[PDB]
Design a protein around this ligand. Structure first.
Ligand SMILES: O=C(O)c1cccc(CSc2cccs2)c1
Lengths: 211, 213
């Protein structure tokens, strides 16, 4: 059993309701960060100190929210292009956690003091899901949850090509070996394929130079 | 400029957020159109089948060439760029988003389980440009959230629609819970602040991303 919490200013995104199939092995909650503002305008951003383009999310509003939602046992996830890589190994690790809280930021970023503060009560991980930029952590929140949840109790190199019926389609055939029943020959051919594909699409995975 | 995105999936509900995350004005100006399609209208049987056992043995299922064949024949033109998210794909980077941002028709095929029959992509590639791609180093159940990422990533690069690491950022108030904003940022010395940020970026990148260096 495991509890996942998500905070965003766009709570409509996370509503798919895959990760959806649950027989109560985990519960998931989504919160509107505006639930913790006070002024009539609901202001959650301000201009950066030192200058530069765009807005930053205020430290006070996030701080209040997390006070209410987080505990000392909590793992705090902050998706961000400036964070550590989020890999298969990270998913395995977080599949054992009791409590995850994902903080979705928009604009240019969130005050640094927010995660520095949190880091004195609970454990915090700033993470990047890939080398590209999004508008907000909302999509990243989703990716992280899919990757993590599919490893939770009760649910190398690259993988080569897959086939199924029919054995001949539009004049293209399934590789004979797959049809012949030799468990040996099929494992070998499959290993060859998987390796031939990594050298091409992902040379770094076998310690080579990236294109 | 003017871009059309078709998405095929056995979960068309999942893609609710992309079309509910769009500026109305760009839809009015013909800057982008996004259509989601349920992969099952192209099924041939009364059970509406999308997958089938792996040739060669193994666990998990493979997706039928017959169905995806029908589907792509209908949606794709020969100007089409066919995107297929998979963990065995090429890396989807920022350079990739930039490139695709100037394309006219993007077709994204969302597969599930252990993939789509290889022949589908093989065949498509005889009459259009196909790109199989991985959004990161981890396995997701299906291609759906990957599609979400890619769409958001590419469209925030189309005007009027939606190297080291960036260092910390701060805003009002100057003091919060006993932590102060770095005093250099209020100094009025902009040549000096440009350099402070530079160091911050380097340090960060060394810690978090020593590959980039
Ligand atoms: O922290 C923020 O305020 C912020 C600003 C922009 C975008 C995001 C999530 S973006 C992302 C990029 C790669 C992996 S995740 C967050």
């Amino acid at each position: 059993s495991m509890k996942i919490d998500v905070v965003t200013i766009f709570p409509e995104y996370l509503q798919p309701v895959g990760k959806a199939i649950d027989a109560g092995l985990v519960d998931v909650a989504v919160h509107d960060l505006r639930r913790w503002t006070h002024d009539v305008h609901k202001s959650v951003d301000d201009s950066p100190y030192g200058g530069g383009p765009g807005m930053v999310m205020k430290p006070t509003v996030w701080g209040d929210a997390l006070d209410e939602i987080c505990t000392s046992e909590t793992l705090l996830v902050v998706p961000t292009p400036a964070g550590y890589p989020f890999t298969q190994e990270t998913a395995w690790q977080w599949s054992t956690e009791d409590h995850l809280v994902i903080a979705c930021g928009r604009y240019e970023g969130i005050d640094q003091r927010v995660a520095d503060d949190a880091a004195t009560r609970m454990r915090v991980r700033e993470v990047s899901i890939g080398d590209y930029v999004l508008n907000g952590g909302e999509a990243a929140a989703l990716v992280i949850i899919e990757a993590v949840l599919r490893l939770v109790p009760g649910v190398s190199l690259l993988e080569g090509p897959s086939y199924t019926r029919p054995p001949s389609w539009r004049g293209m055939d399934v590789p004979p070996v797959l049809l012949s029943g030799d468990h040996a020959k099929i494992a070998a051919w499959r290993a060859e394929q998987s390796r031939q594909r990594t050298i091409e699409r992902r040379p770094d995975l076998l310690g080579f130079d990236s294109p």
